[PDB]
């Protein structure tokens, strides 16, 4: 398994954990996992900045950042 695919799966696991916790109404756990997905996605952006997948990484970073900013206001 390449470094790209391995990190992509890591980001996915975090993202799934965050959306699950989010829907269960656990703002903090949702936020923790979103941040961890963002950090892995930022790493993927550094490693493959000029590739075609980067636009999707960058899109998801922003979606997750925006969900963080909403959930932060609760708690």
């Amino acid at each position: 398994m390449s470094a790209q695919v391995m990190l992509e799966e890591m980001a996915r696991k975090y993202a799934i954990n965050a959306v699950k916790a989010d829907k269960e109404g656990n703002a903090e756990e949702a936020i923790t996992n979103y941040k961890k997905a963002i950090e892995v996605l930022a790493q993927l952006v550094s490693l493959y900045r000029d590739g075609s997948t980067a636009a999707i990484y960058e899109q998801m970073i922003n979606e997750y950042k925006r969900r963080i900013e909403v959930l932060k206001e609760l708690i």
Binding site: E8, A11, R12, A15, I16, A18, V19, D22, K23, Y34, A37, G51, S52, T53, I56, M60, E63, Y64, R66, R67
Partner: peptide, 11 residues
């Protein structure tokens, strides 16, 4: 290139 499966969108 695309992610398959898609990364989940937030609520």
């Amino acid at each position: 290139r695309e992610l398959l499966p898609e990364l989940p969108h937030p609520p």
